Design a protein around this ligand. Structure first.
Ligand SMILES: *[C@@H]1O[C@H](CO)[C@@H](O[C@@H]2O[C@H](CO)[C@@H](O[C@@H]3O[C@H](CO[C@H]4O[C@H](CO[C@H]5O[C@H](CO)[C@@H](O)[C@H](O)[C@@H]5O)[C@@H](O)[C@H](O[C@H]5O[C@H](CO)[C@@H](O)[C@H](O)[C@@H]5O)[C@@H]4O)[C@@H](O)[C@H](O[C@H]4O[C@H](CO)[C@@H](O)[C@H](O)[C@@H]4O)[C@@H]3O)[C@H](O)[C@H]2NC(C)=O)[C@H](O)[C@H]1NC(C)=O
Ligand SMILES: *[C@@H]1O[C@H](CO)[C@@H](O[C@@H]2O[C@H](CO)[C@@H](O[C@@H]3O[C@H](CO[C@H]4O[C@H](CO)[C@@H](O)[C@H](O[C@H]5O[C@H](CO)[C@@H](O)[C@H](O)[C@@H]5O)[C@@H]4O)[C@@H](O)[C@H](O[C@H]4O[C@H](CO)[C@@H](O)[C@H](O)[C@@H]4O)[C@@H]3O)[C@H](O)[C@H]2NC(C)=O)[C@H](O)[C@H]1NC(C)=O
Ligand SMILES: CCN1C[C@]2(COC(=O)c3ccccc3N3C(=O)C[C@H](C)C3=O)CC[C@H](OC)[C@@]34[C@@H]5C[C@H]6[C@H](OC)[C@@H]5[C@](O)(C[C@@H]6OC)[C@@](O)([C@@H](OC)[C@H]23)[C@@H]14
Ligand SMILES: CCN1C[C@]2(COC(=O)c3ccccc3N3C(=O)C[C@H](C)C3=O)CC[C@H](OC)[C@@]34[C@@H]5C[C@H]6[C@H](OC)[C@@H]5[C@](O)(C[C@@H]6OC)[C@@](O)([C@@H](OC)[C@H]23)[C@@H]14
Ligand SMILES: CCN1C[C@]2(COC(=O)c3ccccc3N3C(=O)C[C@H](C)C3=O)CC[C@H](OC)[C@@]34[C@@H]5C[C@H]6[C@H](OC)[C@@H]5[C@](O)(C[C@@H]6OC)[C@@](O)([C@@H](OC)[C@H]23)[C@@H]14
Ligand SMILES: CCN1C[C@]2(COC(=O)c3ccccc3N3C(=O)C[C@H](C)C3=O)CC[C@H](OC)[C@@]34[C@@H]5C[C@H]6[C@H](OC)[C@@H]5[C@](O)(C[C@@H]6OC)[C@@](O)([C@@H](OC)[C@H]23)[C@@H]14
Ligand SMILES: CCN1C[C@]2(COC(=O)c3ccccc3N3C(=O)C[C@H](C)C3=O)CC[C@H](OC)[C@@]34[C@@H]5C[C@H]6[C@H](OC)[C@@H]5[C@](O)(C[C@@H]6OC)[C@@](O)([C@@H](OC)[C@H]23)[C@@H]14
Ligand SMILES: *[C@@H]1O[C@H](CO)[C@@H](O[C@@H]2O[C@H](CO)[C@@H](O)[C@H](O)[C@H]2NC(C)=O)[C@H](O)[C@H]1NC(C)=O
Ligand SMILES: *[C@@H]1O[C@H](CO)[C@@H](O[C@@H]2O[C@H](CO)[C@@H](O)[C@H](O)[C@H]2NC(C)=O)[C@H](O)[C@H]1NC(C)=O
Ligand SMILES: *[C@@H]1O[C@H](CO)[C@@H](O)[C@H](O)[C@H]1NC(C)=O
Ligand SMILES: *[C@@H]1O[C@H](CO)[C@@H](O)[C@H](O)[C@H]1NC(C)=O
Ligand SMILES: *[C@@H]1O[C@H](CO)[C@@H](O)[C@H](O)[C@H]1NC(C)=O
Lengths: 221, 214, 216, 214, 216
């Protein structure tokens, strides 16, 4: 049972070495660029407001990246290959929804997973209000909306974005939602501004949805 | 007698300082240092059920308990203190969360925890929760049925194992004049597997059947 | 006069010296224990019943809650500190009890600066003004007999062997109640209660606030 | 060269702030032996909402507060002739003035910073949105509705803090011309309150506003 | 590449070194004075008119507000810092101006991470995205001429001798305005104004944002 206090001490020592004994990573630069992978799972479309043209979505947004400053040798740490930590202990990217109408709300505990090769996985669940015209949601063809995500302060030469797939994950979508999903895609886009040389990257989340019509009966999920 | 109670008070200051200021905070469980967390619910009120958004608002107390070796002490060195209350910010707490909440949880009680000499912690946040629920049927005799799963957000079953003492949600505090009456409320431990990973994942499924008070 | 100015200066330095000896000398009070229990006195003054929602069965109440307790670690000899017999300070500088409404439906909102009064015998007086939403069925509010609701207040984490709760009176103070409120108060009472549970030896104390009210 | 003088005046300001704030313990607040006079004045910006279902009204206003501390004085000659500065309100003591009949926490609409001058005067001007207890009945007639809310210290009696007003007329010059509600009059009046339990008098400023639908 | 990783490490150290020298090596900037006046450039990009409330005469606007200024104490020689000419940093790490909307009815809400760009000549660029409720009478929004509203922005505590405000253009940027908004913009202008008060010698500067809009 002295093995247990031992591995606890190894973890404590690892985090102290990583966090306490080095200054926090200052973020990416044009000389030290970063790639952030984004992926979305849509959970629920909660509300569509046709008087303001705002829609409210609940989703999980997976973010991952890699820092050399987060690497270690599992063998000096008693074979710890990964650990959970508070997101406040690490640098995280400034990714944001460009068309939000209210401050995004965080639904999940804010913690991340770091492994020995320096990879970070951060998966905040969020509630978002964003600009969307729901017109046609009460029909069978439904309504279509889009919101773009990306760094607020960094261009493409500092932070690049990529997605693993263009399919947004619907496997967790709430089956009894007021709204059913017809389709959801997530697409990397490159934009330029005349005033500036560098590219700007965003991931475009496009959702087609309609009012769910129920039969009379219990729909179980 | 009044000079004993000053020692008593100094004994706790000393115990608190020895636990909290001497080693670092517990950095969560690991695969080879896993932790069991007991979870149990007491439902207070169903406040609102919204047909327009399909969200329901529950008020409840969520009882969490676990045990840490680093929180143990010998009461004889501490003036026979067997336990104390402390701010929850002073201790590690599990990341248990409702998977299908639609709004940030609202905290209805001061956040303090009880720690006892064998290192067991008792944490009892009272909360208001909005979660995804379709209230249809709430006006029938059969009523409406909703489910919300709770568990660790970031830790798997090899790190945090999750348990209940009973599969019965505690109704003894449920508000008798609520707009909604409770037909049944259950809390069931479930084990889940993802094809992506060998690790089992644990949740407690809170299932509630309810209808408008008639 | 620079004699008056010096006087002012010396008296400020005295209060500063008192506060520094109390607060910066010994670690903050760790809270009460079985061997060192604390008595907390509660009293309520009702200000407005702002609304009653019959769709959710919630009521919103504005009130002032007076809390007071004594700590030996807050005591001083006024002779050593310029004849200061008391002072006002931020509620953050001192231990406060964990008293909470057991049947709130939303986090309680604090309406007043959070400051407390401390006296040389170690007594603390703290009067937060608050707005609370709590579970109440306001059926009958539209009839002469009115509606009745109750909410219990007490320590969330400390049982009766640690914190003992008491009331000055069993009569809620109505003297500051808003005369133009949508609801008039038929009566309000505040009563200490002691509860025991099969599971546990320790008694649990609360103060039970019962308000009977109807539309103006 | 010119950048040198500017650099010097910055150093001067920083030196003054350090001497005032870092080089001494903050003012403990007023006492019976060291009382403080606080000047209060109101400018009404907008009556936003009048809710007849709850009897609450929502006002946007700025509240001017000023007082003088000997411990904020300095000789401009030792400070590069700085006669005043702007500072964060957290850096200095501010009085506990409060609306006694508020129904929700006041919302702060302006950056919280104060102006301090060499003679020790502080000027602090928070812009606020306030919901308070008011019965709007009559708001739909030509006579209008009347409402009053009292402002004063929460924790200090008249022997510690004394309130004064510059004038009994509330400043309307900034009132929003297109507001849903028109102002017939607004007065701000110092009042002395007595309670049976206590020798100490209690001071407040009573803000009375007559208004009607525009 | 392994030596390529040494170079990245070195560049991280350079930036960390830079920030440490700017921030931890001096007391905070105390803000502007009449002897060290400051010019702030303001520009607006209109995003959405979310809601026009005719029962309260409040309108809710989503916009980006670009603020730019220059501090001598933020300058550095890139040659001493590995040729870094700019960096991003948390807005909390720097002084920021007190610019505020004078006719807001609710606290402004921040929609974007608060970080700023600083470059070697001492220029800062801060671009908060915000949602603002302000006093506006939406009458005529359902007609052809539409409705017209205006809100003034400027320093809350500094006069013209300390903070001067400019705009680069009198034209609000509409290129990002949501095409599907409930409301379409007929025009938006942003104009520097100089306010004078009888009581005071010092002028007070503001930027007046005027928006003419109607139901789509
Ligand atoms: C610190 O950072 C700074 C800023 O990042 C950096 O300075 C810049 O460095 C880069 C890399 O050197 C420069 O970008 C390059 O530009 C090259 C083209 O410019 C050359 O040709 C220009 C045009 O000449 C014609 O036109 C003019 C009229 O316009 C006319 O008078 C001429 O006669 C001629 O007809 C010319 O203006 C320019 O001359 C300037 O710069 C040189 C050297 O810097 C200097 O000697 C001169 O006196 C004068 O100041 C120059 O001759 C371009 O070819 C090159 O692109 C190649 O490499 C890139 C990758 O680097 C590839 O993408 C591409 O495929 C090519 O292979 C590159 O884009 C930039 O112009 C520098 N200067 C400034 C101010 O931005 C420093 O180097 C950094 N310091 C350190 C220590 O790292
Ligand atoms: C700091 O602040 C707190 C309050 O915020 C102050 O607390 C007070 O402390 C004093 C001193 O301990 C208390 O006085 C004592 O009271 C007890 C109990 O009797 C009181 O309450 C009883 C029921 O609640 C009741 O029997 C009594 O009623 C009668 O008596 C009072 C007059 O005292 C009268 O007003 C009533 O009409 C009744 O006739 C009474 O309410 C009492 O037993 C103590 O008595 C003895 O000791 C005193 C000297 O202390 C002596 O003079 C007597 O002869 C006797 O020997 C004592 O009177 C008071 O109750 C506390 N009030 C509280 C807690 O709110 C505290 O004093 C402040 N400190 C300082 C330094 O200012
Ligand atoms: C700092 C704020 N920032 C937010 C921006 C905002 O981007 C977007 O909203 C956006 C991006 C790609 C495609 C469409 C976008 N978009 C819109 O343009 C409106 C709508 C809400 C939306 O989704 C992110 C990228 C870049 O900053 C890294 C910006 C660009 C960099 C450059 C560009 O100026 C033309 C542009 C900025 O204007 C400011 C900068 O000037 C220094 C910026 O505010 C955003 O412009 C859209 C754009 C800059
Ligand atoms: C990090 C966030 N986290 C939240 C999750 C969320 O879990 C659930 O929502 C859930 C769990 C059991 C049963 C039903 C669940 N569920 C749903 O799946 C939708 C509905 C709202 C709901 O309640 C907790 C457990 C685990 O993390 C410890 C997750 C799984 C671990 C693994 C799994 O990937 C296949 C899965 C994650 O996708 C991410 C991970 O990849 C590293 C995760 O986001 C959640 O997936 C549902 C699931 C992970
Ligand atoms: C820590 C949370 N705490 C809140 C409680 C809550 O108290 C009440 O809600 C309550 C008390 C007396 C009478 C009625 C009460 N009540 C209700 O039960 C419903 C309604 C909201 C209400 O007012 C305060 C006192 C004590 O904690 C010091 C509790 C008791 C201690 C003991 C008791 O268990 C039987 C009881 C607790 O259940 C938990 C404990 O077991 C771990 C507790 O959650 C509360 O029980 C009501 C009760 C505990
Ligand atoms: C500490 C909180 N405090 C708020 C009070 C509240 O003041 C008012 O509400 C008020 C003041 C003057 C005129 C009318 C007032 N008033 C009302 O009383 C109802 C309505 C909301 C309103 O505006 C401020 C002044 C004094 O505090 C320095 C109080 C008085 C000091 C003394 C008085 O006891 C009778 C009175 C207090 O009751 C408590 C105290 O006991 C130590 C107090 O809570 C307030 O009483 C209204 C009154 C005390
Ligand atoms: C400190 C608070 N402050 C906010 C003010 C508020 O500014 C405005 O509201 C404003 C400014 C320019 C033009 C129109 C303005 N305005 C209005 O006045 C009403 C309407 C809402 C609006 O936008 C900012 C500028 C200056 O402070 C730097 C003020 C002026 C400086 C001077 C002026 O006194 C006459 C005036 C102040 O009254 C207080 C001061 O006394 C020291 C002030 O509160 C604001 O007056 C509008 C005005 C001062
Ligand atoms: C510390 O806490 C645990 C529970 O959190 C206590 O364990 C209990 O032991 C008592 C023996 O009287 C039993 O009532 C329970 O069955 C045990 N708990 C559980 C969950 O089964 C332990 O005794 C506590 N130590 C004390 C009280 O000092
Ligand atoms: C730092 O940023 C400033 C702008 O904030 C840049 O200065 C601008 O340069 C452009 C192009 O020459 C000119 O229009 C003006 O001289 C500047 N604009 C403003 C607002 O002053 C500058 O390029 C940057 N400095 C360095 C050296 O990188
Ligand atoms: C860490 O995570 C990355 C991303 O999934 C993975 O490719 C890598 O193999 C992991 N490293 C270790 C040692 O676990
Ligand atoms: C305190 O009071 C005593 C009288 O009891 C007096 O002699 C003394 O001067 C006072 N102390 C101060 C500092 O005023
Ligand atoms: C400081 O403020 C007061 C008014 O509050 C004014 O009378 C005075 O002139 C100012 N400065 C001084 C006294 O030098």
């Amino acid at each position: 049972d002295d093995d247990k206090l031992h591995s606890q001490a190894n973890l404590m020592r690892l985090k102290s070495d990583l966090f306490n004994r080095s200054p926090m990573y200052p973020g990416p630069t044009k000389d030290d660029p970063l790639t952030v992978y984004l992926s979305f799972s849509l959970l629920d479309i909660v509300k569509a407001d046709s008087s303001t043209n705002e829609v409210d979505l609940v989703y999980w947004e997976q973010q991952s990246w890699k820092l050399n400053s987060l690497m270690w040798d599992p063998n000096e740490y008693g074979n710890i290959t990964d650990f959970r930590t508070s997101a406040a202990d690490i640098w995280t990217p400034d990714i944001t929804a460009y068309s939000s109408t209210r401050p995004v709300q965080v639904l999940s505990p804010q913690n991340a997973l770091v492994n020995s090769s320096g990879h970070v996985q951060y998966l905040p669940a969020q509630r978002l209000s964003f600009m969307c015209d729901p017109t046609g949601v009460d029909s069978e063809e439904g309504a279509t909306c889009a919101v773009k995500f990306g760094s607020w302060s960094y261009g493409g030469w500092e932070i690049d974005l990529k997605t693993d797939t263009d399919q947004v994950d619907l496997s967790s979508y709430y089956a009894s939602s007021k709204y059913e999903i017809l389709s959801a895609t997530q697409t990397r886009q490159v934009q330029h501004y005349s005033c500036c040389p560098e590219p700007y990257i965003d991931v475009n989340l496009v959702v087609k949805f309609r009012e769910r019509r129920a039969g009379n009966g219990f729909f179980r999920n």
